[PDB]
Design a protein around this nucleic acid. Structure first.
Length: 849
DNA sequence: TAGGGTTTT
């Protein structure tokens, strides 16, 4: 055993702590307590009964409202506002199956509608059902919820259906995404919402008694949420016979979902796109005649293939397929040539290039921007080149989607962001690398990695679709048909990659107490060892006890829309009066960071983050300081110049502020804060005490610790608590820095790409880990007295301080158990404040002088 | 010295 720095406290400080704890130890209405015990006493039968009396609103119908929307509908279908709209609707393929669909929903509880894009299933199926209920005289019985995976889609689709119905948004159709809603009228209505909104509303209505029809869309994408939702539909619908659900899918393994719902009726609706011709690597080379020069395991794939096409291609075209670099995007000069080829031949239209990630977008941007070849210098002035990437600004401006200036052709260099998330309408040509990046969590080594991999057949068909929204397009795939043959059908469904602590906790609020049982029933059941790992984390942070039952703390965490570790950090900041900086750290880690990474400016972005960090050695507090500067930028009417000079996204910052207010308002509702305003003076009496903020951050990120050992920009010898050598990710503020006041760090995410990096980190102090961690014991090892945390990191510590810290931890354990069970703000002049002050005192010993 | 992409009453 190695022994770290001494953490013993002075006599005078220890005496004040003993007095504070002894004043805390002379202390003698809980709606929450009653609800927590009620959840733990009832079995599932009682819980289904009890939720059916409490959610009874749609037992009530209004016949005069029914009668008036019926008559109003019949005559507004004689106006010429509509009836232009209505015959333009009838040109969508879905509307010819209108009556077959109405009849199928009436006769069956679950149906499935399969259709390619342009078929109108999302637009039309909700209104076919809605207008049928209104026509039949049953308007007020009808409440239609239709889920979508992405926030942008729920809005645009709702604004479209509202237009198709000659209404301002909010009367018959509405949308609800998180922290923004234009709600439809209460009854006879269609609401589009993200799947996550629906999932949060089960906590209050777990058997879906507040809607009459549920439509799940784009389920073939196998997001965690809709895969989760279908699992719970098999629990709910045996108890909701009147509820109608309509599954909706693209033609991507349609049959899986039909199989799941044992064999339900399945419609196939034709689509509307223009033909997109597909070329593979052998076809591109025979048209570009490009030549390369500056493992294998390749040959066994390509040489059989080269014999079955031998008479369909020139022999020299086939010999380039023998090169492993011809495949994918290993040679960017070859992608630049195919861009140059489309510019000379092959008439008007924008080019959409899919490359895996930032590094290879940067490469092809620079070859087209500052060409080395004369062929490319030819074309530099006649291309308007746009990189597209979720950390780049181009998506949140308006030029990437408008048509290019006269005499210039648009070239978009994009990651998979342009497959579904972002949409460009005048694209005619797609260059499909066939390579993207994916995250791989390995249960065996607990190493999450970011690897470049081949795309799936579902992927390439989506990319080919992006070429046929305007004209017949062309799609070039930079890989052979032999490579396509060995591609997977779909990407790994993401629930097999995710960690489950958040889901397991959410299930216990739906009275699904065994997660091994229920998770085994999804389409793709996760590794039961991942569940074991999720449960052990939830046991560690004490959201479940050691028999696995929900604790009072765990019930509050389950009700916060944020991963449960960061949920805990937010509660802590409510009881330790540092709420505004800590909810900033939490929001940013759950959402993304507000900094762009524009091309060519990486070293300048490094300076900005270094300056916003104010030398506090933490990526988390850096964000909070960025947010403090953004508010001052707005108070100053200098917001756009501030965002310009610092490479920050206004819209991300404005979203992080809506999230911090959501957290404080939730905490105010749960009786943990006196005020809902997260910048309130009383909730932030300690918000400037930097050592205390590292303590609360660590209380959330624990047990993700790392210890630093050497120096030299600088070279770091560092390792996580488990012994693996790590480094800070170069995008982190602590990469390469020299002279840390402490050698210990906490982190949210470890990731291997070129090395094992920490993507974010805060420098932390040993006494903070001791107070808020576990695995704390006192003893002697060489002949010196120690005190340790996680039984991993051992610190020299006198026996007077170790006696006080152990007794201080035991009172902190008791205080948290009380505030979870009987929520109230900590009163500024009471017994519980005395314990808090004891902790403020100890941690303050580590401020930089 | 490096950053696939969604999303939460």
């Amino acid at each position: 055993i190695r022994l770290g720095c001494n953490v013993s406290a002075p006599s005078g400080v220890l005496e004040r702590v003993k007095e504070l704890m002894e004043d805390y130890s002379r202390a003698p209405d809980a709606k929450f307590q009653q609800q927590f015990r009620h959840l733990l006493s009832v079995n599932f039968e009682e819980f289904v009964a009890e939720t059916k009396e409490r959610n009874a609103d749609l037992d009530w119908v209004n016949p005069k409202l029914d009668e008036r929307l019926q008559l109003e509908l019949g005559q507004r279908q004689l106006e010429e506002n509509a009836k232009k709209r209505l015959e333009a609707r009838k040109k969508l393929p879905t509307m010819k199956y209108a009556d077959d669909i109405i009849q199928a929903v009436r006769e069956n509880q679950v149906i499935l509608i399969v259709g390619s894009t342009g078929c109108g299933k999302t637009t039309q199926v909700p209104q076919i059902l809605l207008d049928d209920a209104i026509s039949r005289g049953c308007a007020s019985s009808c409440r239609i919820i239709c889920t979508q995976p992405r926030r942008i889609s729920a809005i645009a689709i709702a604004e479209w259906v509202s237009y198709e119905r000659c209404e301002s948004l909010g009367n018959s159709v509405g949308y609800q995404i998180r922290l923004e809603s234009r709600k439809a009228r209460e009854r006879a209505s269609i609401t589009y919402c993200t799947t996550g909104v629906l999932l949060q509303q089960l906590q209050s209505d777990p058997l879906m008694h507040n809607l009459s029809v549920l439509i799940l869309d784009e389920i073939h994408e196998r997001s965690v949420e809709t895969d989760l939702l279908m699992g719970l539909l098999k629990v709910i619908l045996p108890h909701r016979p009147d509820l109608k659900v309509i599954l909706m899918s693209a033609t991507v393994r349609e049959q899986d979902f039909c199989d799941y719902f044992n064999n339900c009726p399945m419609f196939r609706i034709e689509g509307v796109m223009f033909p997109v011709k597909m070329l593979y690597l052998e076809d591109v080379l025979s048209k570009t005649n490009y030549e390369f020069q500056k493992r294998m395991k390749h040959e066994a794939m390509i040489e059989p293939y080269l014999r079955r096409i031998r008479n369909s291609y020139d022999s020299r075209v086939l010999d380039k397929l023998r090169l492993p670099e011809s495949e994918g995007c290993e040679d960017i000069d070859f992608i630049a040539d195919l861009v140059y080829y489309i510019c000379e031949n092959e008439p008007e239209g924008a080019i959409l290039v899919f490359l895996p990630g930032y590094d290879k977008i940067s490469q092809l941007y620079n070859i087209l921007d500052k060409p080395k070849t004369s062929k490319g210098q030819r074309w530099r002035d006649h291309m308007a080149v746009f990189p597209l990437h979720s950390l780049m600004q181009s998506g949140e401006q308006q030029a990437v989607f408008r048509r290019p200036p006269a005499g210039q052709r648009k070239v978009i260099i994009s990651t998979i962001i342009a497959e579904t998330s972002v949409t460009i309408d005048d694209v005619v040509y797609v260059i499909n690398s066939g390579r993207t990046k994916a995250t791989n969590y390995d249960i065996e080594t607990n190493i999450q990695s970011l690897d470049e991999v081949w795309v799936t057949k579902a992927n390439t068909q989506q990319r080919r679709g992006r070429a046929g929204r305007v004209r017949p397009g062309i799609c070039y795939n930079l890989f052979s048909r032999a490579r396509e043959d060995r591609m997977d059908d779909i990407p790994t469904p993401e629930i097999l990659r995710s960690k489950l602590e958040s889901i397991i906790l959410s299930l216990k609020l739906l009275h699904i107490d065994d997660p091994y049982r229920f998770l085994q029933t999804l389409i793709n059941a996760p590794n039961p060892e991942a569940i074991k790992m999720g449960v052990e984390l939830l046991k560690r942070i004490e959201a479940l006890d050691q028999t696995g039952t929900l604790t009072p703390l765990g019930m509050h965490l389950a009700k916060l829309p944020i991963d449960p570790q960061m949920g805990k950090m937010i509660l802590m900041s409510a009881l330790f009066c540092c709420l505004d900086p800590i909810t900033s750290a939490a929001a940013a880690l759950s959402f993304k960071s507000p900094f762009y990474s524009p091309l060519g400016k990486e070293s300048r972005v490094d300076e900005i983050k270094r300056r916003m960090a104010r030398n506090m050695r933490s990526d988390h507090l850096m964000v909070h300081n960025t947010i403090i500067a953004y508010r001052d930028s707005r108070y100053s009417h200098a917001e756009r110049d501030f965002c310009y000079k610092n490479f920050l996204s206004s819209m991300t910052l404005q979203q992080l502020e809506r999230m911090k207010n959501q957290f404080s308002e939730l905490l105010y509702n749960y009786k943990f804060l006196a005020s809902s305003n997260c910048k309130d003076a009383a909730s932030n009496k300690n918000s400037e005490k930097i050592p205390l903020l590292r303590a609360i951050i660590g209380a959330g990120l624990y047990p993700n610790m790392a210890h630093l050992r050497k120096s030299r920009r600088a070279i770091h010898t560092m390792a996580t608590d488990d012994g693996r050598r790590v480094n800070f990710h170069p995008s982190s503020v602590n990469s390469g820095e020299s002279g840390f006041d402490s050698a210990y760090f906490v982190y949210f995410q470890r990731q291997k790409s070129t090395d094992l990096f920490l993507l974010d980190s805060t420098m932390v102090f040993p006494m903070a880990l001791i107070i808020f961690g576990d695995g704390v014991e006192a003893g002697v090892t060489q002949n010196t007295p120690y005190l340790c945390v996680a039984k991993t990191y051992y610190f020299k510590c006198n026996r007077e301080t170790a006696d006080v810290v152990i007794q201080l931890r035991s009172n902190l354990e008791k205080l948290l158990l009380k505030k979870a069970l009987y929520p109230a703000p900590i009163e500024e002049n009471g017994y519980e404040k005395q314990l808090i002050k004891a902790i403020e005192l100890l941690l303050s010993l580590d401020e930089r002088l």
